[PDB]
Amino acid sequence: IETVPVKLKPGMDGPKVKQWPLTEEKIKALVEICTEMEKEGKISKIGPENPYNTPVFAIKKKDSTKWRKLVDFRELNKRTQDFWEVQLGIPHPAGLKKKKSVTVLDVGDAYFSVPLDEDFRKYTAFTIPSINNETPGIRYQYNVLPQGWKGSPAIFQSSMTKILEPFKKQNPDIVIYQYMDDLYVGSDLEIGQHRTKIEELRQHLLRWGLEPPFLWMGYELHPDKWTVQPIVLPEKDSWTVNDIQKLVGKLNWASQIYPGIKVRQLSKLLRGTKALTEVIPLTEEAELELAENREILKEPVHGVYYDPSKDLIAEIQKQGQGQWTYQIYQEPFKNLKTGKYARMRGAHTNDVKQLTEAVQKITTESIVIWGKTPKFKLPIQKETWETWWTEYWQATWIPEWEFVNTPPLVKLWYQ
Amino acid sequence: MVPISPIETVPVKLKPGMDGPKVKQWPLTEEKIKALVEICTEMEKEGKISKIGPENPYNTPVFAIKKKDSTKWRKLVDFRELNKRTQDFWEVQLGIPHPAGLKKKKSVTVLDVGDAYFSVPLDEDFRKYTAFTIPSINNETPGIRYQYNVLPQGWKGSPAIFQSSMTKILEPFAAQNPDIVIYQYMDDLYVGSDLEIGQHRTKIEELRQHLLRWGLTTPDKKHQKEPPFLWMGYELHPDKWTVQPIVLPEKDSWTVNDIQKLVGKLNWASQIYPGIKVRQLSKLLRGTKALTEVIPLTEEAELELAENREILKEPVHGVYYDPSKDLIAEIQKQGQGQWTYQIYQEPFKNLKTGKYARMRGAHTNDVKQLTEAVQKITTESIVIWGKTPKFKLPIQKETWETWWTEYWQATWIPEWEFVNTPPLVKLWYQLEKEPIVGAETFYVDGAANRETKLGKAGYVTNKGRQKVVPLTNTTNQKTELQAIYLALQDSGLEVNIVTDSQYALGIIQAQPDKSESELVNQIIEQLIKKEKVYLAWVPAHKGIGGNE
Numbered sequence: 001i002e003t004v005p006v007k008l009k010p011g012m013d014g015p016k017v018k019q020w021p022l023t024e025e026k027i028k029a030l031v032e033i034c035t036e037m038e039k040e041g042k043i044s045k046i047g048p049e050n051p052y053n054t055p056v057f058a059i060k061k062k063d064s065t066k067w068r069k070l071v072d073f074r075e076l077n078k079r080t081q082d083f084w085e086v087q088l089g090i091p092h093p094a095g096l097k098k099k100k101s102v103t104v105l106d107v108g109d110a111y112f113s114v115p116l117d118e119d120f121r122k123y124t125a126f127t128i129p130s131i132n133n134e135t136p137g138i139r140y141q142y143n144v145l146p147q148g149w150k151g152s153p154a155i156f157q158s159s160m161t162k163i164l165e166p167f168k169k170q171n172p173d174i175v176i177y178q179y180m181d182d183l184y185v186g187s188d189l190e191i192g193q194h195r196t197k198i199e200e201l202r203q204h205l206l207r208w209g210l211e212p213p214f215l216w217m218g219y220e221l222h223p224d225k226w227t228v229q230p231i232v233l234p235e236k237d238s239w240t241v242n243d244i245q246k247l248v249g250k251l252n253w254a255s256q257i258y259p260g261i262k263v264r265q266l267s268k269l270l271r272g273t274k275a276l277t278e279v280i281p282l283t284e285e286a287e288l289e290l291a292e293n294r295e296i297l298k299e300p301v302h303g304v305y306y307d308p309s310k311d312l313i314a315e316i317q318k319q320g321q322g323q324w325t326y327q328i329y330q331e332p333f334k335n336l337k338t339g340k341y342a343r344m345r346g347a348h349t350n351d352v353k354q355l356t357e358a359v360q361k362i363t364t365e366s367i368v369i370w371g372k373t374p375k376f377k378l379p380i381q382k383e384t385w386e387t388w389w390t391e392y393w394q395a396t397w398i399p400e401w402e403f404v405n406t407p408p409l410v411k412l413w414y415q
Numbered sequence: 416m417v418p419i420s421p422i423e424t425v426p427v428k429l430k431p432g433m434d435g436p437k438v439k440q441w442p443l444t445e446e447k448i449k450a451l452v453e454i455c456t457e458m459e460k461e462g463k464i465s466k467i468g469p470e471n472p473y474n475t476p477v478f479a480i481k482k483k484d485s486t487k488w489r490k491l492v493d494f495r496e497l498n499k500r501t502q503d504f505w506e507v508q509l510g511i512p513h514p515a516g517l518k519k520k521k522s523v524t525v526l527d528v529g530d531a532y533f534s535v536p537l538d539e540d541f542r543k544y545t546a547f548t549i550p551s552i553n554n555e556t557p558g559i560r561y562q563y564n565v566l567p568q569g570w571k572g573s574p575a576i577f578q579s580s581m582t583k584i585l586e587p588f589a590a591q592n593p594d595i596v597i598y599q600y601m602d603d604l605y606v607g608s609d610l611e612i613g614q615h616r617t618k619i620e621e622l623r624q625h626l627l628r629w630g631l632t633t634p635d636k637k638h639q640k641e642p643p644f645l646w647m648g649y650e651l652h653p654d655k656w657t658v659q660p661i662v663l664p665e666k667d668s669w670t671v672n673d674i675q676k677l678v679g680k681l682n683w684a685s686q687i688y689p690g691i692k693v694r695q696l697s698k699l700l701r702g703t704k705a706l707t708e709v710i711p712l713t714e715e716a717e718l719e720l721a722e723n724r725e726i727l728k729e730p731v732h733g734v735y736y737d738p739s740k741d742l743i744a745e746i747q748k749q750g751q752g753q754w755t756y757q758i759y760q761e762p763f764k765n766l767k768t769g770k771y772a773r774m775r776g777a778h779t780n781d782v783k784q785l786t787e788a789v790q791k792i793t794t795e796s797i798v799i800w801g802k803t804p805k806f807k808l809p810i811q812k813e814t815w816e817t818w819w820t821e822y823w824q825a826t827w828i829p830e831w832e833f834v835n836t837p838p839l840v841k842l843w844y845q846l847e848k849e850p851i852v853g854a855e856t857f858y859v860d861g862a863a864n865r866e867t868k869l870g871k872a873g874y875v876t877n878k879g880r881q882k883v884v885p886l887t888n889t890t891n892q893k894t895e896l897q898a899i900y901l902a903l904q905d906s907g908l909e910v911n912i913v914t915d916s917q918y919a920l921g922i923i924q925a926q927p928d929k930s931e932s933e934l935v936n937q938i939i940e941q942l943i944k945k946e947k948v949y950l951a952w953v954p955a956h957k958g959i960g961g962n963e
């Protein structure tokens with residue numbers, strides 16, 4: 001009821017980010033949403049003396065027909081002060097990723113119950129554009145904690161803890177973790193029982209409220225089943241020159257990650273000038289070297305540690321036939337996680353939809369494990385991505401990304 | 416009197432840490448001073464300005480300018496300094512509408528609101544910053560000091576505050592009259608509708624009455640301006656639009672500036688005149704910016720111009736948007752990285768046209784370019800019509816599938832259909848996924864001395880075939896490509912090639928069909944002649960025979 005003072009970082013002005021083009025249906029959806037929000041006092045019309053802007057659009061959450069407003073506060077969040085006054089930080093729960101089932105709840109609506117510092121509201125300005133700019137864009141600012149703003153969970157933290165206290169007491173083995181608008185609830189219970197605890201939570205949540213449009217929903221994860229990708233070498237009875245070349249290449253690459261990798265003896269098989277498809281018998285020296293390399297690759301990478309002070313970087317490769325590989329790291333050759341997707345959620349003829357889904361899934365994994373999002377290196381041209389990603393986006397957060405324009409050779413080695 | 420609703424003033428601030436202007440008033444002739452005194456006396460009477468005491472420490476210069484071919488003077492306040500110190504505002508504009516996005520209207524009326532333009536109140540706390548001084552006769556008395564009570568002409572915030580204030584007024588009228596459209600341009604309101612003329616003119620009078628609530632009168636004697644409207648470089652008609660006349664001059668010699676002006680007109684024309692091209696004419700502007708320098712037109716530039724003159728020989732008009740019909744976008748390849756398109760709903764009736772040019776870069780191919788053009792058109796279409804058009808593209812469905820399924824990047828094109836109008840976009844070569852049985856295997860390599868820039872390129876094959884060529888003025892990277900080129904030249908229709916060149920792999924995996932490097936272009940032409948090519952990479956300097 002009383003506002004927490006909030007400021008931008010030193011020597012730093014508010015966001016002035018252009019609204020990107022929106023389809024007719026998204027505009028109409030936003031006009032409807034914002035009309036109601038305005039009636040509820042959540043947002044207010046603003047004047048021309050407010051020069052700030054943050055882009056806005058709309059999505060449809062997974063398995064729903066109702067539009068959700070999504071503000072791209074990425075710029076504002078960068079420019080917003082860091083919040084360590086009450087707590088140095090919420091130490092990330094290492095147990096969350098170890099639960100058998102984790103449900104993700106959209107509790108972003110709760111934020112609207114807290115007023116936003118009168119002096120900071122102007123920085124939350126956004127615009128509903130009109131088709132072809134035929135009428136003036138509708139300008140709003142927030143009067144309450146906005147969804148997607150990093151300050152919202154920080155300011156609402158004390159309130160959420162109080163809300164969750166009784167449920168925690170009664171269920172001490174349940175792990176609850178909040179990231180932005182998302183609430184992650186993990187347990188080792190039978191899914192039927194689990195879904196009953198989730199519903200139990202929703203009730204305890206509603207009780208405080210007195211209705212939330214998306215609280216009823218539940219997105220189920222199973223992080224204990226999340227798979228990794230060690231380096232494996234082929235097992236063959238017949239090696240062609242080409243096979244051996246690919247093996248040496250892969251080992252050469254692996255030797256940047258693993259010290260004792262040797263290719264001397266195997267390279268010695270490539271002595272001479274033979275047809276690529278000719279079968280080469282392995283020498284004893286080569287088989288031993290190959291065997292010793294296999295053993296090395298069964299071990300973890302050495303000196304691999306997570307540092308919360310550094311960015312997480314995510315790289316993705318298109319492997320074809322709807323398959324995608326990815327790595328998360330902070331330092332080159334020091335992968336913190338690797339994985340592969342194949343499953344297609346109705347995108348068998350749309351690369352960009354597949355990539356967008358991969359990005360969201362990787363981001364989810366990152367949040368669960370380290371409690372923050374990675375910076376993506378996307379194998380896609382900027383213009384193609386920027387034109388389409390919002391059409392397939394179903395999360396309430398948005399990570400950072402950059403674009404890869406040069407084909408990596410490493411694609412071959414993660415295949 | 417009839418009470419009128421007051422107009423909410425917009426709170427205005429100076430930029431952080433900045434104070435108001437303190438600029439010396441220029442001396443003025445006795446003639447100009449008298450002119451300003453009368454003008455300001457009148458403005459003061461109307462309440463637009465007020466005399467202020469000597470306490471106000473701010474000042475902005477005022478000038479008198481002789482309105483040409485007349486004896487009447489005009490008052491000009493130079494707000495350049497104050498504008499530097501005034502906060503940024505929100506451009507209520509957001510962008511200018513494109514005519515192709517407009518809807519056809521049976522009637523469009525113009526209302527003069529000029530006597531509103533100058534009546535918006537200025538934030539009380541900011542007025543002091545607008546202070547100016549009329550110098551006194553012979554400077555024997557204090558100058559007459561005034562400040563503004565309304566938005567001044569030339570002040571940074573006047574357009575934004577004016578637009579927002581008029582929008583606020585018009586909003587409820589537009590909202591409660593969804594069967595009209597309203598648009599403000601300068602000091603005029605444009606009101607369009609499809610209503611029966613009678614119902615329409617009633618709407619106009621109702622708007623006049625609505626505006627009266629804020630004490631805003633509009634001239635009974637209706638506007639002189641009538642369709643067609645000249646607006647932002649366009650001509651708007653009730654049921655069609657075009658660009659204002661495009662006249663390409665005859666000239667014996669062309670200057671940098673002239674060419675810039677030519678390209679500008681061509682660019683402007685290209686949004687409704689199909690097939691406009693500017694590649695060769697823009698090429699003449701490469702790197703140099705001496706606006707007076709004369710450039711000889713290339714023979715290629717001359718043809719391009721001649722082609723344009725033909726396209727421009729007679730008027731072309733676009734139609735307006737029909738929301739009940741699909742948008743269709745058709746694209747053609749023009750050559751030299753040039754692409755042109757038309758957007759229409761009915762055959763032979765374009766809403767608009769346009770062009771796309773290849774991005775600068777080392778290597779490229781038609782499919783990438785076509786893809787980029789699609790994304791440009793898609794984005795432009797969202798802006799103008801709020802939806803993606805269905806595309807008609809000169810590329811076969813099978814060609815596209817082969818491309819995107821095998822391309823290393825994610826790529827996508829929205830709903831589209833093949834249109835069989837040459838030249839078609841195709842794949843010129845496709846590398847094998849597996850080594851070729853029975854095909855000779857070429858192990859290639861090259862190297863150069865960084866100092867003397869002498870090098871060698873060559874190959875050895877499984878059949879004993881060998882070649883080494885000595886090269887001058889070269890680099891390691893160049894020799895690596897030359898080696899691949901030699902293998903392609905000296906091999907049969909099917910060939911396996913083994914290289915350690917990461918550089919060459921990076922280029923070829925990008926699948927260029929055209930390049931800035933003539934060597935790459937030579938490689939491409941060789942690839943096109945092959946039936947099967949498998950390219951294999953190995954790491955260098957690891958004892959790999961053949962490659963060793």
Ligand SMILES: Cc1cc(/C=C/C#N)cc(C)c1Nc1ccnc(Nc2ccc(C#N)cc2)n1
Binds near residue numbers: 516642644646
């Ligand atoms: C942008 C705009 C500029 C002018 C005028 C600008 C000036 N000068 C006049 C109007 C009414 C509008 N607004 C809209 C909105 C939707 N459809 C249309 N269609 C439309 C507009 C003019 C003519 C004509 N003649 C025909 C159709 N106009």
Ligand SMILES: [Br-]
Binds near residue numbers: 463
């Ligand atoms: Br005036």
Ligand SMILES: [Br-]
Binds near residue numbers: 648660
């Ligand atoms: Br023109």
Ligand SMILES: [Br-]
Binds near residue numbers: 805832
């Ligand atoms: Br079509």
